[PDB]
Design a binder for this molecule. Structure first.
Ligand SMILES: CCCCCCCCCCCCCCCCCC(=O)OC[C@H](COP(=O)([O-])OCC(O)COP(=O)([O-])OC[C@@H](COC(=O)CCCCCCCCCCCCCCCCC)OC(=O)CCCCCCCCCCCCCCCCC)OC(=O)CCCCCCCCCCCCCCCCC
Ligand SMILES: CCCCCCCCCCCCCCCCCC(=O)OC[C@H](COP(=O)([O-])OCC(O)COP(=O)([O-])OC[C@@H](COC(=O)CCCCCCCCCCCCCCCCC)OC(=O)CCCCCCCCCCCCCCCCC)OC(=O)CCCCCCCCCCCCCCCCC
Ligand SMILES: CCCCCCCCCCCCCCCCCC(=O)OC[C@H](COP(=O)([O-])OC[C@H](O)COP(=O)([O-])OC[C@H](COC(=O)CCCCCCCCCCCCCCCCC)OC(=O)CCCCCCCCCCCCCCCCC)OC(=O)CCCCCCCCCCCCCCCCC
Ligand SMILES: CCCCCCCCCCCCCCCCCC(=O)OC[C@H](COP(=O)([O-])OCC[N+](C)(C)C)OC(=O)CCCCCCCCCCCCCCCCC
Ligand SMILES: CCCCCCCCCCCCCCCCCC(=O)OC[C@H](COP(=O)([O-])OCC[N+](C)(C)C)OC(=O)CCCCCCCCCCCCCCCCC
Ligand SMILES: CCCCCCCCCCCCCCCCCC(=O)OC[C@H](COP(=O)(O)OCCN)OC(=O)CCCCCCCCCCCCCCCCC
Ligand SMILES: CCCCCCCCCCCCCCCCCC(=O)OC[C@H](COP(=O)(O)OCCN)OC(=O)CCCCCCCCCCCCCCCCC
Ligand SMILES: CCCCCCCCCCCCCCCCCC(=O)OC[C@H](COP(=O)(O)OCCN)OC(=O)CCCCCCCCCCCCCCCCC
Ligand SMILES: Nc1ncnc2c1ncn2[C@@H]1O[C@H](COP(=O)(O)O)[C@@H](O)[C@H]1O
Lengths: 459, 50, 120, 49, 320, 347, 100, 19
């Protein structure tokens, strides 16, 4: 995986030696080249993962998250270069360096063969994200949002550190490839109950679990646009990736440890979706919708059936692209009206028709319109949860009502109705902005042609 | 070269790619020794992969 | 832990038996990382004194690199020595005490009963 | 000239630059000599010649 | 550095050059006392180095090319706008006063550095011991607030205590009427707006607070407007002083070494001029500070340390 | 102070600590502690103000009481063993008295009550000596008597130090008291792994000395003793805000920094010995240390507090202070985690 | 009053100084070349050649093989009268059960 | 519209005797 680590590190002298007008173009160009190179990871096999070395390996779970991670960096550079135009040159290079460092930490988070190196990268991703939120966020509450984002995560993750070192001392290894073959069943005891909580609660915070999600409608809201893109599209998915790696070791106790948390998501996705019906802040609506979508991934990983893991990894990739595009649309209106209040700028289809078409497409992917991979992941999770217990379709189907009802309300409040009279700085859609919307939406639509690459290791 | 900054990331790929190939020769303990793929070597062949 | 081992020959940074070991290469990636730490120290030393970071005092930057590679080479030699002593003591203790380390009879999975837990 | 006062680092301390380059060159040649002596001693103690 | 503890160990004691003519003399007086020539006159009879009275751009003279910086980078304050609007809203009065106090502190550090490094005495014009006499004269006119006087007193309390007072304070008696006559003969259109009460308050804090408190810690000399015109009488009075007061007498090589290590570290001298007391006349917000700092870095010879600027033609940078 | 006298007195401080490190007789241990205290008292009274005399009085009283308890532990060892070898002690009462005396010398809780006072009362360089060099000699004596140290006592002192150094720094704005409560928490972390693996104790001591030396060197280079004067650093020297950012994120133990290195290794040695509750509660308590580190980074690096006008004068003067080993210590205190298996050199 | 603060700067319109702006940069040559870099290396390179690469993956996770291989095995066991699949994955001769 | 940076009210919280 060193053929992706070294170009990502060479992005640092590429941005610190570029000319002062050239640091966006060069980083965008070569991060798109790294994203083009990322497709070589699709050398996957039906039985064996692509096992590079003692340190790095990539199965069909890590591979779509790697492609999405390496694709998200140029899109974040395009999204973030407008509001940092008057920024100091060295602080601009520090911002780009934090994004590059975050990509570097993520692409060897997903390919970490051994789990304590997974933990070190998984918690190394906090520091650039924390710095981006608390340094280039816009409002006063970015500092409190950074504190919440840091301290839910560490309070979750330090028992994970203790539990992973315990697995190291007991099983002798934390290689995932070794632990595929040396995994011992985990019986019913209180020691194994807190073993399960220590192995799971960090990823429960990072998904986020409902009830532990409180960091997110601050951290996703107070961040700048590149911070919201990487938090929604990649950094929530570290929790689901780590759950799919760690629930190998947690059988068969998971079959009765999952019961509270499944409830916490199956009711919680009803609640947060309902919360999206009454959000006045558009960016907070997208944050609570991210919680609502990741609750299904939490249920699908806890019920641990093949259809559930396939729908969970499809829904993770699909939600990455969809929520990243939704935050970019919300920023494209924030760069004009300078307020995140959704009721302020109305009737924008009269003023920006092509941008309203992008709003329509991202809303339809948010509400899981078939045959998008949003609907593929949504549908496979609903199939597996119906096979889990037949009553859950109620909480699924009711969810799919409310998920429509905030997605089109977001489409109706912002784009439809009479336009606001006193707002007159509504510029036409820049080419950078429409390029950003298309570079989100067009891969999300092309993946419906060949969805088998985003369906995990057990397609 | 006037555009020497546009070879930092590509050569950093190629060099990185090189190291991966250099890594594979250090993981060749079971080359042509697996129970699934072991065979006799062809004429003018010294290794089964590189 | 190993403090009784290096007590009959005290304050020896690299003992004579360390010369039985293969020394780290000059292209050791740990040694190259320590040289990178020297280069970063040179850049921070230019930055804190408000010099041009990449250009000013190349002799000073090169002495930073040289000094970190020089110290880190011997630190890696002692590291490899102490892990070699660790494994030598382990293997000599396993050899001298067979009654504590018996060969476990490895049973194939045709005999080994595992309880099936259905996921449904 | 530009400055109203001559700065302490207007001119390079040539004694210090010479000591810097000489100390660095000495440490490199001593490191390479130590490494060659170490690989020769390893090959002599373990019989790989 | 050039001087340090090692130079003190290797024989450079500062009393080997501290001669009888190594006297720090300060000339004081009202706004048009005519003392500005008298200082130079004393400095051309005793062989002393004359420092002109530090304006807003003293630090601009000591650093860089010596030319005055634009007013947003040094000062952020206008003496002429103080003469026009003393009771201004933007707080130019106390901002000008605090900048002038920091400038006089830098000048006094330079003067002690020259005295302790060469053994040549320095004639100053209105040192830091005679700066508060303007502050009170502003405060008694309602030009500044009580909180500004509190900020000034905190800065002065933690700064002036680390220095020795002068040997000689030469005060010049010029009354308010003759000061106004010389202001009107000067013809500066801003300076002619100075009220009578402000000049009278300058004279009152001179005669009632400054000169009594310097009468214990040095030997004050006081001349009228016409007996200060004869410089040789003043130099005769200076050369026949029997110095028996002030803390200059209990100064060995160690204390003066500590003082010389103070007055060559200019950021250590200027450490407490920017104390975090948030006062609206001196507090600059983050955006203005960021903008003015990034503009100051782009000035020629100002981006790097002084020997490290190719844009002014520094050489051998790759070996420094 | 005369610079020759300063050199001789600092060499005498170093001589006392080295005599503690190299001696085989308990009287020379006690002599090294006496020489260390006697020589470090003028370092604390360097500026001659009543806070330095109060701090030196409190330091003298605590170290003198610890020296008397140390000599009583030595004398009871001579009772019950008839000899003087600096090794294990031959009585649990002498072991308890020596552990109490060394906890008083290190300032571990509940004998911590002198550490935030004395560090506040003295300059930054003498506080650096007190928080880095003055730990080395008692940790050496604790290193050599660990076959006799009571487990319950050393872990009680450890967890009480970690919790009290966590809660103490949350209420502070003075930087020296922040470094002192950081000292108390880190000494708790060092003594919690002493009876399990003392190589990790030495590792934690070395990484702590590097990070504390970096933070005191930054505080000396910027001449800041308070939070709110440290917040003026971005308008004076923007690189120093980056350095205090990465060093404070290291001292909290965030990966991938090197200050994550000791505590992780400590957990790596405490779970081998079937202690799971104790390093977990220690790691959760270290979040408090990380919280007030994050408070300092928000004040200094990640935001811009309002500055004053006279700062514009200090823009025209570069720093003439000898920032000794500051780039070296900054690199070592941040980017050393990929070299974590170097710790075997401490075995 | 309050301190010395720069006022809120007005928002720039990129179309005023450059009505042909693509919204990347205020320099029009830098703006147009950033447009060309994004459109070429994003759409002409990663999207088109990327979808061509994904469209011709060499039997991604050996599914097609597993079809064709199944077409062997069924043809082997429709012809030899064998059942299409055993309920036991492993041979019951090579399994020791725990006795009771 | 520009980035929030701390005021005097934020900064005086960090300037007392205690926190
Ligand atoms: C490399 C990493 C370390 C670099 C340290 C120095 C960086 C620096 O000075 O940059 C300035 C310099 C350019 O500056 P300049 O124009 O000359 O002058 C200074 C400016 O005026 C600057 O203007 P200013 O100072 O007046 O005001 C702007 C202000 C702006 O600052 C602010 O406004 C405040 C801060 C803003 C918010 C915070 C943003 C993030 C910053 C901190 C980073 C945190 C994350 C780090 C990792 C996570 C853990 C915490 O400050 C700066 O920009 C200061 C410059 C430093 C910026 C970069 C800081 C890097 C050090 C910290 C990270 C690395 C070490 C820790 C890593 C930990 C583990 C991964 O940058 C470079 O030159 C970068 C290097 C590019 C070339 C690399 C060549 C590599 C060659 C390799 C082969 C040869 C060696 C072989 C080795 C092997 C031998 C065997
Ligand atoms: C073994 C343990 C070594 C522990 C550190 C020993 C030195 C530091 C302690 C004493 C001290 O502060 O000395 C000042 C100190 C520089 O610290 P500084 O004042 O903060 O640096 C600012 C600039 O260097 C100021 O520059 P400048 O314009 O004044 O003149 C340039 C200066 C001129 O240099 C000279 O003049 C040197 C040649 C004359 C030496 C005396 C001959 C008699 O160049 C340098 O000093 C370059 C810095 C070299 C790096 C310093 C640290 C060395 C490595 C320490 C251990 C690192 C281990 C990393 C392992 C990581 C993984 C675990 O050292 C020197 O000046 C000489 C360095 C010689 C290094 C030899 C290393 C191998 C020894 C065998
Ligand atoms: C690998 C080769 C692949 C080749 C085939 C392509 C496969 C799909 C790729 C992506 C397709 C969408 C891209 C165009 C639309 C987005 C931009 C837009 O709105 O432009 C309007 C604009 C025309 O409007 P205008 O009057 O000029 O101005 C717009 C007004 O301001 C305002 O305009 P407006 O609001 O009046 O009109 C907007 C309207 C809005 O229309 C709607 O809202 C109605 C659509 C939803 C309901 C009906 C469809 C439900 C699902 C059934 C269809 C799928 C399965 C069908 C198969 C049978 C059953 C299995 O959009 C459409 O009618 C678009 C028709 C196609 C819709 C596709 C589904 C999007 C719905 C959401 C997701 C549904 C699930 C995923 C489906 C994925 C299928 C692959 O279109 C263009 O200028 C075209 C731009 C270039 C398009 C390039 C397409 C390929 C991109 C990939 C490049 C790399 C691969 C190379 C392929 C190259 C092929 C030539
Ligand atoms: C985000 C906030 C919430 C985070 C929740 C994090 C998970 C919650 C549970 C964590 C428990 C502590 C770590 C357990 C690690 C288990 C490893 C192991 O081997 O266990 C078996 C071992 C068993 O010991 P053993 O394995 O050495 O013994 C051999 C085996 N037997 C037992 C059969 C002899 O368990 C323990 O030793 C104790 C486990 C329980 C620890 C209880 C103390 C902590 C209480 C919960 C704290 C929760 C977070 C607090 C902070 C909140 C925010 C401020
Ligand atoms: C992937 C994980 C990260 C997610 C984000 C990724 C972003 C980075 C982007 C990298 C490059 C792109 C990667 C994904 C590419 C996906 C596309 C792809 O490769 O597809 C392969 C698919 C593969 O299909 P296939 O599997 O049948 O191919 C057969 C295999 N071969 C060719 C070898 C025999 O290509 C096609 O389907 C091409 C068919 C022709 C083109 C499509 C025509 C129909 C489409 C709809 C037309 C309109 C119908 C009517 C509609 C009316 C209006 C509504
Ligand atoms: C607020 C934000 C949202 C929430 C975020 C998540 C926080 C909570 C995370 C933990 C949730 C509870 C723990 C998981 C329960 C799984 C099943 C279980 O253990 O049930 C409780 C137990 C059932 O009894 P039994 O199964 O017999 O236990 C004997 C085991 N040998 O019942 C009992 O034995 C009785 C109760 C005993 C006390 C248990 C206390 C520890 C668990 C809670 C902490
Ligand atoms: C930089 C390192 C410079 C080292 C120079 C040589 C010093 C030396 O010879 O030290 C001897 C010592 C090994 O002696 P030993 O008896 O094993 O120590 C027992 C300690 N408990 O060697 C060591 O302890 C080497 C490791 C010291 C590292 C200290 C800085 C980190
Ligand atoms: C198993 C381990 C065995 C033992 C191994 C070795 C342990 C080393 C422990 C280091 C302890 C350092 C103690 C502090 C330095 C002592 C000398 C001193 O007082 O230096 C400060 C000095 C005072 O100058 P002054 O003018 O008073 O400054 C105030 C402003 N006027 O000057 C200054 O103020 C200059 C400003 C910078 C000073 C930086 C000093 C850094 C020293 C520590 C380096 C890091 C530790 C060494 C590497 C790791 C070793 C483990
Ligand atoms: N608070 C103040 N009010 C007026 N003038 C001042 C003040 N502080 C310093 N000065 C300076 O003192 C000068 C008067 O001394 P002189 O050099 O005799 O003209 C003025 O021209 C100012 O430059």
């Amino acid at each position: 995986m060193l053929k992706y680590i070294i170009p990502t590190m060479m992005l640092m002298p590429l941005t610190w030696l570029s000319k002062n007008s050239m640091i966006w173009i060069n980083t965008t160009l070569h991060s798109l080249l790294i994203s083009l190179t990322s497709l070589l990871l699709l050398n996957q096999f039906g039985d064996n993962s692509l096992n590079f070395s003692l340190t790095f390996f990539s199965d069909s779970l890590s591979t779509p998250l790697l492609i999405l991670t390496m694709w998200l960096l140029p899109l974040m550079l395009m999204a973030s270069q407008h509001h940092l135009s008057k920024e100091n040159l060295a602080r601009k290079k520090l911002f780009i360096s934090m994004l590059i460092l975050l990509q570097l930490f993520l692409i060897m988070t997903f390919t970490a063969t051994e789990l304590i190196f997974f933990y070190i990268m998984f918690e190394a991703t906090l520091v650039p994200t924390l710095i981006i939120i608390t340094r280039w966020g816009n409002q006063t509450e970015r500092l409190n949002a950074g504190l919440y984002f840091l301290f839910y995560t560490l309070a979750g993750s330090l028992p994970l550190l203790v539990a992973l070192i315990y697995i190291q001392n007991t099983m002798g290894s934390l290689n995932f490839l070794i632990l595929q073959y040396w995994v011992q069943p985990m019986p019913n005891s209180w020691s194994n109950t807190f073993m399960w909580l220590a192995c799971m609660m960090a990823f429960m915070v990072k998904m986020p679990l409902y009830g532990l999600h409180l960091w997110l409608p601050k951290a996703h809201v107070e961040a700048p646009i590149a911070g919201s893109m990487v938090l929604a599209a990649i950094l929530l998915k570290l929790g689901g990736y780590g759950m799919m790696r760690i629930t190998l070791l947690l059988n068969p106790i998971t079959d009765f440890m999952a019961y509270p948390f499944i409830m916490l998501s199956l009711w919680g996705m009803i609640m947060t979706s309902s919360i999206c019906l009454r959000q006045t802040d558009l960016k907070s609506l997208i944050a609570y919708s991210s919680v609502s979508h990741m609750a299904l991934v939490i249920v699908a990983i806890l019920i641990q059936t093949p259809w559930s893991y396939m729908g969970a990894t499809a829904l993770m990739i699909a939600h990455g692209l969809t929520s990243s595009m939704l935050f970019c649309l919300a920023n494209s209106n924030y760069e004009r009206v300078h307020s995140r209040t959704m009721i302020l700028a109305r009737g924008l289809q009269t003023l920006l028709p092509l941008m309203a078409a992008w709003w329509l497409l991202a809303s339809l992917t948010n509400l899981a319109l078939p045959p998008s991979i949003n609907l593929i992941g949504e549908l496979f999770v609903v199939m597996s949860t119906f096979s889990w217990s037949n009553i859950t379709i109620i909480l699924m189907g009711l969810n799919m009502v409310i998920t429509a009802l905030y997605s089109l309300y977001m489409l109706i409040t912002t784009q439809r109705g009479k336009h606001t009279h006193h707002i007159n700085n509504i510029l036409p859609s820049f080419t950078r902005e429409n390029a950003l919307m298309s570079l989100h939406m067009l891969p999300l639509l092309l993946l419906s042609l060949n969805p088998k690459i985003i369906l995990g290791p057990l397609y | 070269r006037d555009h020497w900054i546009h070879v930092l990331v590509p050569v950093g790929f190629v060099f990185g790619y090189y190291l991966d190939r250099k890594n594979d020769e250090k993981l060749a303990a079971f080359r042509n020794k697996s129970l699934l793929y072991k065979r006799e070597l062809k004429p003018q062949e010294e290794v089964t992969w590189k | 832990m190993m403090t009784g081992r290096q007590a009959r020959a005290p304050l020896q940074f690299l003992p004579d038996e360390a010369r039985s070991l293969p020394p780290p290469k000059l292209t050791d990636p740990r040694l190259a990382y320590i040289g990178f730490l020297g280069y970063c120290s040179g850049l921070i030393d230019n930055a804190i004194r408000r010099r041009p970071v990449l250009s000013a005092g190349l002799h000073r930057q090169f002495l930073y690199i040289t000094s970190f590679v020089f110290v880190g080479y011997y630190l890696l030699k002692r590291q490899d020595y102490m892990y070699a002593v660790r494994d030598h003591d382990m293997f000599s203790y396993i050899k001298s005490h067979p009654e504590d380390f018996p060969e476990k009879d490895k049973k194939t999975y045709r005999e080994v009963f595992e309880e099936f837990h259905p996921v449904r | 000239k530009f400055y109203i006062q001559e700065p302490p680092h207007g001119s390079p301390n040539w004694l210090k630059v010479g000591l810097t380059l000489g100390t660095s060159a000495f440490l490199w040649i001593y490191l390479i000599k130590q490494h060659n002596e170490d690989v020769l001693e390893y090959k002599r103690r373990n019989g790989l010649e | 550095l050039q001087y340090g503890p090692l130079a003190y160990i290797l024989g450079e004691k500062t009393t080997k050059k501290m001669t009888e003519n190594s006297k720090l003399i300060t000339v004081d007086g009202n706004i048009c006392s005519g003392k500005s020539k008298l200082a130079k006159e004393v400095a051309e009879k005793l062989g002393l180095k004359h420092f002109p009275e530090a304006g807003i751009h003293y630090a601009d003279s000591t650093t860089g090319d010596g030319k005055p910086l634009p007013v947003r980078f040094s000062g952020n304050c206008s003496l002429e706008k103080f003469y026009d609007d003393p009771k201004s809203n933007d707080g130019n009065s106390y901002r000008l006063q605090a900048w002038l106090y920091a400038s006089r502190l830098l000048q006094y550090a330079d003067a002690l550095e020259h005295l302790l490094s060469t053994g040549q005495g320095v004639v100053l014009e209105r040192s830091i011991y005679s700066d508060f006499v303007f502050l009170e004269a502003m405060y008694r006119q309602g030009f500044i607030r009580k909180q500004c006087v509190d900020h000034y007193n905190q800065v002065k309390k933690v700064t002036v205590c680390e220095y020795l007072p002068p040997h000689v304070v030469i005060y010049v008696d010029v009354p308010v009427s003759e000061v106004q006559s010389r202001i009107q003969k000067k013809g500066n259109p801003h300076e002619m707006k100075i009220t009578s009460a402000y000049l009278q308050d300058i004279e009152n804090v001179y005669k009632g607070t400054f000169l009594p408190e310097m009468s214990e810690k040095c030997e004050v000399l006081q001349y009228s407007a016409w007996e200060a015109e004869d410089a040789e009488k003043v130099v005769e009075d200076i050369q026949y002083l029997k110095y028996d007061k002030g803390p200059w007498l209990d100064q060995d090589d160690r204390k003066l070494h500590n003082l010389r290590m103070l007055v060559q570290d200019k950021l250590e001298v200027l450490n407490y001029t920017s104390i975090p007391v948030f006062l609206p006349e001196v507090t600059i917000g983050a955006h203005q500070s960021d903008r003015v700092f990034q503009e100051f870095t782009e000035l020629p010879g100002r981006k790097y340390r002084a020997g490290y600027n190719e844009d002014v033609g520094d050489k051998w940078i790759w070996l420094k | 102070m005369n610079p020759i006298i300063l050199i001789i007195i600092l060499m005498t401080v170093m001589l006392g600590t080295i005599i503690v490190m190299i001696s085989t007789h308990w009287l020379l241990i006690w002599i090294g502690f006496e020489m260390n205290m006697l020589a470090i008292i003028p370092i604390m009274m360097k500026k001659h103000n009543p806070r330095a005399t109060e701090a030196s009085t409190k330091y003298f009283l605590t170290q003198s009481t610890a020296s008397m308890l140390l000599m009583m532990a030595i004398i009871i060892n001579l009772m019950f063993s008839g000899q003087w070898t600096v090794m294990k002690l031959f009585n649990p009462m002498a072991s308890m008295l020596m552990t109490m005396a060394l906890a008083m010398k290190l300032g571990m809780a509940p004998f911590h009550f002198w550490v935030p006072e004395v560090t506040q009362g003295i300059p930054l360089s003498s506080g650096l000596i007190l928080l880095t060099w003055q730990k080395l000699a008692p940790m050496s004596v604790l290193y050599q008597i660990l076959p006799s140290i009571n487990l319950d006592l050393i872990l009680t002192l450890s967890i009480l130090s970690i919790t009290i150094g966590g809660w103490g720094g949350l209420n502070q704005t003075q930087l020296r008291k922040i470094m002192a409560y950081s000292s108390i928490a880190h000494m708790g972390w060092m003594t919690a792994v002493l009876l399990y693996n003392p190589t990790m104790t030495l590792l934690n001591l070395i990484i702590y000395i590097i990070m504390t030396s970096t933070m005191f060197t930054l505080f000396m280079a910027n001449s800041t003793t308070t939070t709110l004067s440290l917040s003026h650093t971005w308008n004076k020297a923007p690189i120093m805000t980056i350095l205090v950012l990465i060093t404070l994120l290291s001292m909290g133990g965030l990966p991938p920094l090197s200050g994550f290195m000791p505590k992780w290794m400590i957990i790596q040695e405490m779970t081998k010995n079937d202690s799971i509750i104790l390093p977990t509660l220690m790691a959760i308590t270290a979040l408090l240390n990380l919280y007030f580190y994050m408070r300092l980074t928000y004040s200094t690096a990640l935001t811009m507090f309002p500055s004053t006008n006279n700062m514009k004068m200090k823009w025209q003067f570069p720093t003439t202070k000898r920032m000794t080993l500051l780039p070296t210590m900054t690199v070592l205190s941040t980017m050393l985690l990929p070299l974590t298996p170097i710790l075997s050199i401490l075995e | 009053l309050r301190w010395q603060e720069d006022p809120e700067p007005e928002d720039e319109n990129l179309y005023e100084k450059n009505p042909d702006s693509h919204g990347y940069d205020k320099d029009p040559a830098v703006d147009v070349w950033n447009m060309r870099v994004v459109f070429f290396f994003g759409f002409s390179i990663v999207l088109v050649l990327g979808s061509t690469f994904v469209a011709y993956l060499p039997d991604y996770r050996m599914q097609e093989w597993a079809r064709r291989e199944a077409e062997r095995l069924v043809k082997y066991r429709e012809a030899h009268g064998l059942p299409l699949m055993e309920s036991n994955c492993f041979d019951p001769s090579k399994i020791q059960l725990p006795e009771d | 519209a520009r980035q929030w940076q701390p005021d005097v009210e934020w900064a005086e919280q960090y300037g007392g005797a205690v926190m």
